Design a protein around this ligand. Structure first.
Ligand SMILES: C=CC1=C(C)/C(=C/c2[nH]c(/C=C3N=C(/C=C4\NC(=O)C(C)=C4C=C)C(C)=C\3CCC(=O)O)c(CCC(=O)O)c2C)NC1=O
Length: 153
């Protein structure tokens, strides 16, 4: 359960994300795709890009980073009371996209990396701990909804 002060740390660095959601989305997905190339396979509109400039140049990748961060920012704003927001994610992610929990760990790790890299002044140890807790709560709750839906994840 995060404390109120930990949610404030999470939402404080997220306001920095919100100044440029698409730029942050491209960097997060580029870090994910470079760290774990196999996740790039889920994306047919850009599964063949090979360099960072290609990926920066991709309109579909840029749109997808905004899809990811818009939904993730609405979740975090719920401060853990996110069941209604997670219900549509877990449906499509369990039945159409088939996204393993290991993949949700990989992008969490990409998210923390890009936040440290772009916002180290607003993402010190305590903020990093608070964000790691919020993403760990999101992954736990998704994982349990995937099981309800018969997807192991
Ligand atoms: C916290 C991260 C995160 C969130 C909140 C997220 C949200 C999210 N992903 C989407 C699509 C999708 N999401 C994925 C894939 C993934 N989705 C994943 O969680 C992971 C780690 C992969 C990694 C391969 C795919 C393949 C689509 C469809 C993309 C498309 O068809 O244009 C959509 C559009 C509607 C739908 O299909 O559900 C939303 C809102 N995606 C995220 O990555």
């Amino acid at each position: 359960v995060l404390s109120e002060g930990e949610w404030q740390l999470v939402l404080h660095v997220w306001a920095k994300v919100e100044a440029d959601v698409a730029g942050h989305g491209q960097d997060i997905l580029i870090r994910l795709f470079k760290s774990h190339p196999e996740t790039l396979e889920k994306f047919d509109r850009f599964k063949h890009l090979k360099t960072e400039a290609e990926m920066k140049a991709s309109e579909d990748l840029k749109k997808h980073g905004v899809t990811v961060l818009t939904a993730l920012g609405a979740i975090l704003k719920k401060k853990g009371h996110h069941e209604a927001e997670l219900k549509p994610l877990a449906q499509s992610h369990a039945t159409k996209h088939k996204i393993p929990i290991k993949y949700l760990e990989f992008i969490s790790e990409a998210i923390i990396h890009v936040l440290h890299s772009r916002h180290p002044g607003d993402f010190g140890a305590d903020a990093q701990g608070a964000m790691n807790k919020a993403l760990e709560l999101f992954r736990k709750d998704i994982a349990a909804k995937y099981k309800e839906l018969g997807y192991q994840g």
